Amino acid sequence: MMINTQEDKLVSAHDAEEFHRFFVGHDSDLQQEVTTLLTREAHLLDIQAYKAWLEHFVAPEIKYQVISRELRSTSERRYQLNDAVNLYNENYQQLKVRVEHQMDPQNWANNPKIRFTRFVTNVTAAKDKSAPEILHVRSNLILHRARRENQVDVFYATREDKWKRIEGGGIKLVERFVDYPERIPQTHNLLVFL
Amino acid sequence: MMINTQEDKLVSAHDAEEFHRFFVGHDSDLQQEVTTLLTREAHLLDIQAYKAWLEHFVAPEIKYQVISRELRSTSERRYQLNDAVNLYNENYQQLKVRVEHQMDPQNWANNPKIRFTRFVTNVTAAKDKSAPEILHVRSNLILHRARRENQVDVFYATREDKWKRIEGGGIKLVERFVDYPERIPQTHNLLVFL
Amino acid sequence: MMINTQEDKLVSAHDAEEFHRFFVGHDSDLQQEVTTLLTREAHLLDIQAYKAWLEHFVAPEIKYQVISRELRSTSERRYQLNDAVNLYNENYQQLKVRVEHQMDPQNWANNPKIRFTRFVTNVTAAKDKSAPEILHVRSNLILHRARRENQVDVFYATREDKWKRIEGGGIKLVERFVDYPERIPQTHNLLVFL
Amino acid sequence: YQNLVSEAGLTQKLLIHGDKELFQHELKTIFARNWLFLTHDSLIPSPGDYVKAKMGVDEVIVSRQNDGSVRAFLNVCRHRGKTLVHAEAGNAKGFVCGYHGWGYGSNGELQSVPFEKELYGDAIKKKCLGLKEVPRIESFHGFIYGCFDAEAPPLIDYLGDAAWYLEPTFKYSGGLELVGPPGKVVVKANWKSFAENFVGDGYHVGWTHAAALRAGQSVFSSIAGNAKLPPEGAGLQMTSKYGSGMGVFWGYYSGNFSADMIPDLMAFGAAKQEKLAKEIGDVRARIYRSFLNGTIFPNNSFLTGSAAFRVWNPIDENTTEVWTYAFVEKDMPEDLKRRVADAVQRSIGPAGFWESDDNENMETMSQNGKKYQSSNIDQIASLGFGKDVYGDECYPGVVGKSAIGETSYRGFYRAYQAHISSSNWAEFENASRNWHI
Amino acid sequence: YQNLVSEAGLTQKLLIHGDKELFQHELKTIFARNWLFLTHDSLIPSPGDYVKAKMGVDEVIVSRQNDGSVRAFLNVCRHRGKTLVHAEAGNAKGFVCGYHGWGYGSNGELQSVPFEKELYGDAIKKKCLGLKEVPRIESFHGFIYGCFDAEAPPLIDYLGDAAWYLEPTFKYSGGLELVGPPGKVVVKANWKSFAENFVGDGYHVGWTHAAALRAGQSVFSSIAGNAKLPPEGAGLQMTSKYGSGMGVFWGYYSGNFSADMIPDLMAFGAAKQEKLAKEIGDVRARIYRSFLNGTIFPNNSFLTGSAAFRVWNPIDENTTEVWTYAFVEKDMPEDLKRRVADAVQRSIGPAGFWESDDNENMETMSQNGKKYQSSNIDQIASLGFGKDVYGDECYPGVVGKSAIGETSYRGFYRAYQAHISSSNWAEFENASRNWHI
Amino acid sequence: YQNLVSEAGLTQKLLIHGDKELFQHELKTIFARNWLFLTHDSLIPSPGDYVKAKMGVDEVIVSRQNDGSVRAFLNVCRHRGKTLVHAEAGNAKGFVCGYHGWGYGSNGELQSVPFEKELYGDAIKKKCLGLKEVPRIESFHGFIYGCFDAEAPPLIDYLGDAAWYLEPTFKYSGGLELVGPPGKVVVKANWKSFAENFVGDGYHVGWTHAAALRAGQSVFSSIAGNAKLPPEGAGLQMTSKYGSGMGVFWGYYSGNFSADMIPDLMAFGAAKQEKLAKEIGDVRARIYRSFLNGTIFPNNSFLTGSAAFRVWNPIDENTTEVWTYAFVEKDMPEDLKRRVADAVQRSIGPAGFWESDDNENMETMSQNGKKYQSSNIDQIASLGFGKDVYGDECYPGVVGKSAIGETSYRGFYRAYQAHISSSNWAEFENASRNWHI
Ligand code: FES
Ligand code: FES
Ligand code: FES
Ligand SMILES: [Fe+3]
Ligand SMILES: [Fe+3]
Ligand SMILES: [Fe+3]
Ligand code: NI
Ligand code: NI
Ligand code: NI
Ligand code: NI
Ligand code: NI
Ligand code: NI
């Protein structure tokens, strides 16, 4: 199953190739394993166990990136200025800083305690063809955040991940990439771990 | 497991029978297979590979139907005018027309490129008892569509499908039916493939 | 996998322990079985088969509880008045009363027939370590309710369940607990079975 | 509100499509005064049948009476003001209020009051507590309209010169049926944006719908890219005293339908045209099988051929609840009727692929009318200006020689401006004494 | 705003439940002037305890002082106007603003200012920068009310003739406790819609709640279908000078609770009734174990028996934040208290099955008040009109002989109209000189 | 609108951050009159390049002309008022309207009209139908501003005494580049809340951002807890005639960036400072590598050092579309430029951890301005009052000796009040004759 990008005029070369990757990479055992992994990760984040997440689910070499893409005309070509701003583009230390800010008793925004609920769907996985310890993972997320009696924000995203198997049986995130679908979020901020 | 529609006063005969179908039709292998099928289909639609979808996932004999049901009193009986309007009721050629309109460089609404994210849940499946090559499939969909900086529309639906196994191993959609739950959508339109 | 609540400052002792429960309790067969159970339950509720649900999916000893937690300062300690109101706290008879009110032809709010769609995700399960017939189940729910042409309410919740295996092969709910994440729901009411 | 539309309806302030206070004023001077579409006989065909309809922002119950007449009432209980009916259509001999149980007849009369004998006695007079009735209900060949203002002209006089153009399809074809239920969807545009597009916008078709024309191969492919006029000619556009108007694209009986509908529809229309020519003449028989796009003032629009009937129900200055019905000729084969009904939704219903193109235009126009600087920009309705005629021997009303034209925009907005600057029908009449000159 | 309620409170324009400008006017003439419910002693029982409450659209911190008194302050920092407190309840000796760190005492005084010595010096006077205080705080048997208007009558005088009816439960039963936290939910109805339903709507119970009565077998099953009056009699309804009013259904101590609550509650109430009769007499001891439904003007409602305490907190003309508490008699066994608390939410909390029925009525009424034509329809409050008495030897205030009646609607709306047509308390008094005649 | 800000800008009614009618008035007296930030040369560097920008609530196309100049036009077609451009940036020699196909040049001229020859003829004059142009476009060292009012002072005169403070970074450092695309997010606060925070709020840093300071170890850790002033001194704050103002924290070139950015940024700034001292002197070379936080009146804010450029685009009285760019010095290594760009979003972009802290303050302030009682509370801007100077030998404008101060709040609000109480620039000038005295 491949996409013909000459006929399929809306499909990027990048997206066509990824679709093929996940199509041929299907493995029933891997699907179950990765679904469990992502469910555990989401549970840990929902209860705000950010230190446990960073230590046990995130690799030292992490790149944690969420972009907002400027809306450009499909038909023009010429304008070549960078089209993406990094809402997140974090290494491990940068995630550590964010985690310590979240947990600090003087983070005024986090009192009273905020409520998170994450819904992970459409999980797919493929072992990398060169580096078998690397698992490519795609999954869709709905994240519900409630605070301050009547504030409700709902986030929608596709996470494009690389995970790595660790000696001892663990699996840790080495890259997460999100092309955030709303150009101007109407969720007050995007200060959530997608 | 059957529903007694005399005691269960809110349940239609149609819904009671379908529930029973999917209850007794449970098969672990089929569940995995159909979950993969629907995840692949949703991925293809999310990246806007509409030609690949129509060619590889949709059968020539397709009936693609989405209705809006007029709200009638539960207790009256007499009024027998048709209660459903077809928002979609498409054969293969009609889907082809829609696909070519979506992809046309002069579809002004589609510039800049719109963003789709689909969440498929609650998948169930049952082999047809007469035609074993036919798979009955039920699944729930959340579809998020973002465009034009600050437009966000979220669609919610149950897809009632018949899929058919093809010589060579493929599986193609022969019927999709959606009874759309909002009588008056507040999503600007319903121009999405549910 | 355990959470260190001294370092993970936002995590309650209760949530840390539950996370560990579901981590070590993972079983592939149980995951499939419970996913099927919850999908069947949600289908039955979506078609409004409330009597079938109460008879076949709910145990006589049921405690069906949904709380709203008053928002308290994270840093104060002293104020020890009860922090939770029971939006639901129902035994079997109390559920029966609610079911009969839902189905009564003179429930004016239910004419025309309302539309429900449920999305169950992030299912996890663990056999109880003492009572092997008891299954602890966690799952996240999005519930969409549409009525009266243009009313749409979307509910978001985590259900913390105990289910019990029955002689004959069935499984029935003995406890459902929901800590509802929005303190002041903006969904008109919370009159839905989560 | 005096200078929002210029002389001869030539320009309109963009603000009209976004201003909150003006919307409130329209509920008084437009929706309280004019004829508003309710339903067709075919949707309430039997005694006790009813539909809910909107008249402006208000909701009415439109009920087939036991004697065969139709009456309509505000959907509001006379006790504490609860909405009475929640179903969109049905059959009932009466309506009971769910709050305290007051029971009304389908004739609006208060019939039953719980505890009347025990607690009310002579403290209630049921004859004074009937549902608030719509005082004017009239029809045009089965299409039923209501008006809140008892002083309104008769519906036929209100249609004015537009009636002549409608008659080949509406009167002389053997009866129409409206196919329900309608598609319904909310669009973030002002009701007037849709009304102007349908009253006279032939100009947009070849540009806005270029992709749709390529994909579906509609007969309108002739004007694709706005490169060439139709080979049949530029067509016609007309307007009338009370604001209704329409364009005519000659011969285009399949309208916005795709190629799969064209052969069978064209054959049906051609066959009836031959019969009709003997009864009403060649020109009018051709109109019967042509594409008419129009608006029946203020907010009811239609297409013939690709037969659609629409209501732009106002919600607020930036929001409209759009209703879309198909209509069919009564003597069409039943399979053709079903195909037409689906084809209307396929083009212009909530999931209509042409509608997607049109809405792209409607929403931003209306949004720009809300913005401070942009709202002072004029819309111009100059196409065909200086060449309209009145008193033509063949074509009545104010008429231009092109369906790609703004003749009917000018007439729509003239009538609109006359209404918003008037307190009653008599003042509208004074403001419209020289409407054609 | 002069003619929105007719003479004797007999009719109300439906518009009152939907009009935006009127809501703004109410924030001045209703919410700025009248007594508004804050909390109960039992929710702030110890020094430093506080709750957030709403007073109209404003938010206040209600704090137990070190000397045992209660003071309340607008929840707004005096520096740049940031909200000071985000928790709904707690215990604290002071409140620090998270923006720049100004620290206030629980007495509202500005105590600490970062960089005071280094940067402010004599450019700050902390005594002039205390939190804006609610000037009037009074209680009625533990129930604490606030008022923004220093000229208001004392709370007890404001309760007027209503106090006598409340006393058996509120004063003579040995103390009540309010059980928190309240249920909270947003409903799309005007605050007045709930207020009128609770002040006097016995009429709806048998109809609106027919299904709930069948399912739960509440004592109110006697009036199911509005077919028959209660065997105990029609009950009573009363109203008072400042707008508070209520109905009395004799004997119905279990109120809207289901059959599983009835035996134990009835036994508890019957036992205390026997004791109370010796202290306050037979009639008032019976009132103690009867069902009272009422409103303490403007927006605090209650039920006795199935003991509920509610606040209809206004958000806008079409939106209300509904708070629902249970209350219990202090000397009830603790298990019974817990059962009562859950049973209140089960009937009328956010997931209350009766509340679902009531809200069905509240939202559409309010929606119809927003619609142009429908908003001119009158609500009528005629039930029992012409038969109310004043100066009865046994029952004080303006009194009717039925809890299925609109005596208290009329009194509520009379007081409402007097307030909206007045600029101050003195003008209200002048407008109310003949309130009972 | 006369008494919303007190004498010397000392107090402001909280209502200003929530009042609907005032917002409408601001669209006339603030946004229609003042210079508004559009873009930087570096975002439209080549002929045909364009960006969309907002000017108040209106949208404009800002286009690089063939001759190298820049022109801007309302994003609205002159035919029926459809929005013309939907991309946020691009390159094009013209803009075609998707409704009917009118084609405009990048110079705003109407160039092509479908069916011009066939249907319009002399009924159209294309020279009269060009896009509505922004009449004033000027720049400050590559930063391009627009103004709807042709009578505005030149941009350089409008910057007034603020220009001197900006020059070390903006003029003398060898050129800045604005790094796009900006972060964009909607925040539920009034545009003025952000404007005041950025114009002069040094006071909040140590308190609001206490957690962020601990986690990231920013140079601002010196003022954590508002316990101690910076060891470098209290800094400066200034304001100017037309409302622009800023604070200066000496030496803090890494601003709100975390420890991982500090060594490399500080080394870069220190090296250029040494060179600059020879050209512009010691004081101004130090300003070059200091942290400036300011607002260019009305709604463009900036930070130097941790180099950010922001626009508070108003949506309504309670809603702002916040744009956040990074800027870089042209001669920075490309890797450093990329690190700076990411670090700006990391602190104050849509997912910025400092921004989370700031927004916590902005939203409630604005919410309180909407509430009836709370809206009458004054904000006070008293910090440093009575100690500001004018005509200092070294530092121009009205100047205070602390970046933790409200000098620039007072100047911002003085200019604001002068504008809202004036009908034109001449009236503003009369109201500002004694601005420094
Ligand atoms: S509101 Fe209809 S019967 Fe009372
Ligand atoms: S706003 Fe509260 S300390 Fe400044
Ligand atoms: S609105 Fe732009 S060409 Fe007609
Ligand atoms: Fe069109
Ligand atoms: Fe009730
Ligand atoms: Fe800050
Ligand atoms: Ni990718
Ligand atoms: Ni650990
Ligand atoms: Ni079905
Ligand atoms: Ni292919
Ligand atoms: Ni738990
Ligand atoms: Ni059964």
DSSP state letter for A80: -
- Closest atom, ligand 2, to C-alpha of E100: 3
Please compute Rg for chain C using Cα positions. Answer: 18
Cα(D383) to ligand 3 centroid in Å equals 12
What is the residue-wise DSSP string for D103-154? EEETTS-EEE-TTIIIIIGGG--GGG----B-SEEEEETTEEEEES-TTPPP
Q: What Cα–Cα distance (Å) separates residue A124 from each residue in A130, E49, F368?
A: 18, 52, 47
Q: Is the peptide bond before B112 cis (omega within 30 degrees of 0)?
A: yes
Cα(F304) to ligand 6 centroid in Å equals 14
In this structure, is the dihedral angle defined by the CA atoms of residues D283, D287, D291 and D295, taken in order, positive or negative?
Answer: positive
**Cβ–Cβ gap F404/E55 under 8 Å:** no
Q: What are residue E93's phi and psi, to 5 degrees?
A: -90, -5
Euclidean distance between CA atoms F37 and F298, whole angstroms: 10
Q: What Cα–Cα distance (Å) separates residue A139 from each residue in A84, A120, C105, D300, F392?
A: 21, 7, 44, 46, 62
**Cβ–Cβ gap E207/D115 under 8 Å:** no
Q: Is the peptide bond before C105 cis (omega within 30 degrees of 0)?
A: no
Euclidean distance between CA atoms F296 and F156, whole angstroms: 12
Paired tokens of E65: 């002082």
DSSP state letter for F383: T
The residue to mutate among E61, E76, E82, having the most atoms of ligand 2 within 8 angstroms of its beta carbon, is E82
Paired tokens of F291: 């942290």
Residues of E in contact with F372 (CB under 8 A): 27-28, 31-32, 56-58
Is F436 annotated as contributing to ligand binding? no
Q: What are residue E151's phi and psi, to 5 degrees?
A: -85, 0
DSSP state letter for F175: -
Euclidean distance between CA atoms C1 and C24, whole angstroms: 8
Euclidean distance between CA atoms E134 and E144, whole angstroms: 12
Mutate: best of F361, F375, F387, partner E, most E CBs <10 A: F361
Closest-CA residue to E200 (of E353, E364, E17, E403): E403
Cα(E367) to ligand 1 centroid in Å equals 15
> At what angle are helices E20-29 and E407-420 packed, to 10 degrees?
80
- Closest atom, ligand 3, to C-alpha of F81: 1
Method: X-ray
User: Phi-psi category of C48—alpha, beta or left, where left has phi over 0 and alpha has psi -120 to 50?
Assistant: left
The letter for the amino acid at D433 is R
In this structure, is the dihedral angle defined by the CA atoms of residues B117, B122, B127 and B130, taken in order, positive or negative?
Answer: negative
User: Phi-psi category of D137—alpha, beta or left, where left has phi over 0 and alpha has psi -120 to 50?
Assistant: beta
Three-state secondary structure call for residue F136? strand
Paired tokens of C48: 């409004």
Mutate: best of F36, F52, F73, F80, partner D, most D CBs <10 A: F80
Q: What are residue D406's phi and psi, to 5 degrees?
A: -125, 15
Beta-bridge partners for F414: none
β-pairing, F236-239 vs F176-187, is unpaired
**Cβ–Cβ gap F86/B148 under 8 Å:** yes
Is F79 annotated as contributing to ligand binding? yes
Contact call for residues F409 and F381 (beta carbons, < 8 A): yes
- Closest atom, ligand 1, to C-alpha of E361: 1
A vs D contact (3+ beta-carbon pairs below 8 A)? no
**Is F100 in the active site?**
yes
DSSP state letter for B42: H
User: Where do the structural domains in chain C lie, given as residue ranges?
Assistant: 1-194
Euclidean distance between CA atoms D1 and D420, whole angstroms: 7
The letter for the amino acid at E188 is K
Cα(D293) to ligand 4 centroid in Å equals 10
Distance from CA of A57 to the nearest CA of C (A): 10
Active site residues of D: 100, 201, 204, 209, 358
Contact call for residues D107 and C133 (beta carbons, < 8 A): no
Percent of residues in chain F assigned helix, strand, coil, to nearest 5: 35, 25, 40
Residues of F in contact with B112 (CB under 8 A): 86-88
**Residue A103 contacts C, CB cutoff 8 Å:** yes
Cα(B40) to ligand 10 centroid in Å equals 14
Paired tokens of D198: 């349908």
Contact call for residues C10 and A50 (beta carbons, < 8 A): yes
Euclidean distance between CA atoms C41 and C29, whole angstroms: 19
Residues of A in contact with E87 (CB under 8 A): 111-112
Is F40 annotated as contributing to ligand binding? no
Closest-CA residue to E287 (of E425, E148, E418, E170): E170
Compute the CA torsion angle C110, C111, C115, C118 (nearest 10 deg): 10
Euclidean distance between CA atoms C23 and F352, whole angstroms: 32
What is the residue-wise DSSP string for F219-272? GGGGGGGG-S--TT-S-EEEE-TTS-EEEEETT-TTTT--GGGHHHHHHHHHHH
Beta-bridge partners for D329: D176
Q: What are residue E88's phi and psi, to 5 degrees?
A: -80, -25
3-class secondary structure per residue, chain E: CCCCECHHHCEEEHHHHCCHHHHHHHHHHCCCCCCEEEEEHHHCCCCCEEEEEEECCEEEEEEECCCCCEEEEECECCCCCCECCCCCEEECCEEECCCCCCEEECCCCEEECCCHHHHHHHHCCHHHCCCCECCEEEEECCEEEEECCCCCCCHHHHHCCHHHHHHHHHCCCCCEEEEEEEEEEEECCCHHHHHHHHHHECCCHHHHCHHHHHHHCCHHHHHHHHCCCCCCCCCEEEECCCCCEEEEECCCCCCCCCHHHHHHHHHHHHHHHHHHHHHHCHHHHHHHCCEEEEEECCCEEEECCCCEEEEEEEEECCEEEEEEEEEEECCCCHHHHHHHHHHHHHHHCCCCHHHHHHHHHHHHHHHHCCCCCHHHCEEECCCCCCCCEECCCCCCCEEECCCECCHHHHHHHHHHHHHHCCCCHHHHHHHCCCCCC
Strand order in the sheet with D70-74: D70-74, D58-64, D49-55, D89-91
Contact call for residues B104 and D354 (beta carbons, < 8 A): no
- Listed in sequence order, the residues at least 6 apart from A81 whose beta carbon sits closer than 8 Å to its beta carbon are F43, F45, F89, F180
Three-state secondary structure call for residue B36? helix
Closest-CA residue to D80 (of E195, F84, C165, F361): E195
- Closest atom, ligand 3, to C-alpha of F102: 3
Find where tokens 């999405």 sit: B192
Residues of B in contact with F87 (CB under 8 A): 111-112
**Residue B103 contacts A, CB cutoff 8 Å:** yes
Beta-bridge partners for E49: E91
Mutate: best of E86, E95, E188, E320, partner A, most A CBs <10 A: E86
Mutate: best of D198, D236, D373, partner F, most F CBs <10 A: D373
Q: Would you give the distance in Å from CA D132 to the centre of its chain?
A: 24
Q: Is the peptide bond before F47 cis (omega within 30 degrees of 0)?
A: no
User: How far separated are the first and last CA of chain C, in Å rounded?
Assistant: 30
In this structure, is the dihedral angle defined by the CA atoms of residues F342, F343, F349 and F351, taken in order, positive or negative?
Answer: positive
Distance from CA of B11 to the nearest CA of A (A): 29
Surface-to-core class of residue F67, CB atoms within 10 Å of its CB (0-12 exposed, 13-18 middle, 19+ buried): exposed
Q: What are residue B7's phi and psi, to 5 degrees?
A: -85, -40
β-pairing, E378-380 vs E11-13, is antiparallel
Cα(A140) to ligand 7 centroid in Å equals 13
Closest-CA residue to B81 (of B69, B63, B66): B69
Surface-to-core class of residue E114, CB atoms within 10 Å of its CB (0-12 exposed, 13-18 middle, 19+ buried): buried
Euclidean distance between CA atoms A164 and A167, whole angstroms: 10
- Listed in sequence order, the residues at least 6 apart from C174 whose beta carbon sits closer than 8 Å to its beta carbon are C59, C61, C62, C63, C134, C162, C163, C164
Closest-CA residue to F209 (of F264, F260, F255, F262): F255
Residue of D nearest to E386 (CA): D123
Strand order in the sheet with D103-105: D94-96, D103-105, D110-112
Paired tokens of E103: 């620290």
> At what angle are helices B92-103 and D353-368 packed, to 10 degrees?
40
Euclidean distance between CA atoms D235 and D405, whole angstroms: 10
Euclidean distance between CA atoms D341 and D325, whole angstroms: 8
The beta-carbon neighbor of A111 closest among C3, C75, C181 is C75
Euclidean distance between CA atoms A11 and B47, whole angstroms: 6
CB within 5 A of ion ligand 4: which residues?
A: D 358
Q: Is the peptide bond before F181 cis (omega within 30 degrees of 0)?
A: yes
F vs D contact (3+ beta-carbon pairs below 8 A)? yes
Residue of E nearest to D147 (CA): E373
Question: Does ligand 2 lie within 6 Å of residue E124's CB atom?
Answer: no
**E-state strands within chain A:** 58-69, 84-90, 115-127, 134-147, 151-165, 171-179
Contact call for residues D305 and D252 (beta carbons, < 8 A): yes
Contact call for residues E204 and C93 (beta carbons, < 8 A): no
Residues of E in contact with D99 (CB under 8 A): 204, 207-208, 361
Contact call for residues B157 and B138 (beta carbons, < 8 A): no
Neighbours of D366 (CB within 10 A): 27
Question: Does ligand 2 lie within 6 Å of residue E99's CB atom?
Answer: yes
Euclidean distance between CA atoms D23 and D56, whole angstroms: 11
Element (DSSP H or E) covering residue D176: strand D176-187
Closest-CA residue to D232 (of D222, D221, D218, D217): D222
Euclidean distance between CA atoms F129 and B157, whole angstroms: 47
Question: Does ligand 3 lie within 6 Å of residue F102's CB atom?
Answer: yes
Contact call for residues C112 and E216 (beta carbons, < 8 A): no
Contact call for residues F131 and F104 (beta carbons, < 8 A): yes
Interfacial residues of E (vs D; Cβ cutoff 8 Å): 14, 17, 196, 203-204, 206-208, 225-227, 229, 234, 360-361, 364-365, 367-374, 377-380, 382-386, 402, 404-405
Helices (DSSP H) in B47-179: which residue ranges?
50-52, 92-103
Q: Would you give the distance in Å from CA E290 to the centre of its chain?
A: 19
Residue of C nearest to A110 (CA): C74
- After which residues does chain B have a break in its backbone, defined as C to next N over 2.5 Å? none
Paired tokens of F345: 């979003």
Neighbours of E21 (CB within 10 A): 9
Euclidean distance between CA atoms D383 and D389, whole angstroms: 14
Paired tokens of A31: 């699907």
Closest-CA residue to D76 (of D117, D36, D134, D135): D134
Paired tokens of D35: 């004829």
Three-state secondary structure call for residue D85? coil
Name all domains of chain D by residue range, CATH numbers in brackets: 1-31+161-437 (3.90.380.10), 32-160 (2.102.10.10)
Contact call for residues E276 and E315 (beta carbons, < 8 A): no
Contact call for residues B10 and C49 (beta carbons, < 8 A): yes
What value, to the nearest 5°, has the Cα angle with vertex E148 and ends E144 and E149?
A: 110
Closest-CA residue to F14 (of F412, F373, F379): F379
Paired tokens of E263: 């035996």
User: Phi-psi category of E418—alpha, beta or left, where left has phi over 0 and alpha has psi -120 to 50?
Assistant: alpha
Euclidean distance between CA atoms F97 and F264, whole angstroms: 49
Contact call for residues D288 and D329 (beta carbons, < 8 A): no
DSSP state letter for C70: P
Beta-bridge partners for A136: A126, A162
**Cβ–Cβ gap C47/B11 under 8 Å:** yes
Contact call for residues D39 and D144 (beta carbons, < 8 A): yes
Contact call for residues D58 and E373 (beta carbons, < 8 A): yes
Euclidean distance between CA atoms D136 and D155, whole angstroms: 9
Closest-CA residue to D287 (of D242, D224, D232): D232
The beta-carbon neighbor of D185 closest among B86, B100, B190 is B190
The beta-carbon neighbor of D74 closest among E206, E377, E386 is E377
Which ligand is located closest to the Cα atom of residue B176?
A: 9
Closest-CA residue to E397 (of E119, E70, E163, E167): E163
Task: Mark E99-113 as b/e (b = at least 16 C-beta within 10 Å).
Answer: bbbbebbbbbebbeb
Which ligand is located closest to the Cα atom of residue A16?
A: 7
Question: Does ligand 1 lie within 6 Å of residue D79's CB atom?
Answer: yes
- Listed in sequence order, the residues at least 6 apart from F189 whose beta carbon sits closer than 8 Å to its beta carbon are F17, F318, F319, F320, F359, F362, F363, F365, F366
Q: What Cα–Cα distance (Å) separates residue B113 from each residue in A174, D367, E161, E170?
A: 29, 21, 68, 65
Greatest C-alpha distance within chain C: 56
DSSP state letter for D421: T
Euclidean distance between CA atoms E177 and E142, whole angstroms: 8
Contact call for residues E257 and E221 (beta carbons, < 8 A): no
Residues of A in contact with E57 (CB under 8 A): none
Helices (DSSP H) in C65-120: which residue ranges?
92-103
**Cβ–Cβ gap F87/A98 under 8 Å:** no
Q: Which CATH number fits domain B1-194: 3.10.450.50, 3.40.50.2000, 3.40.190.10, 3.40.50.300?
A: 3.10.450.50
Helices (DSSP H) in chain C: which residue ranges?
13-24, 28-46, 50-52, 92-103
Residues of C in contact with D98 (CB under 8 A): 108
Q: What are residue D377's phi and psi, to 5 degrees?
A: -70, 140
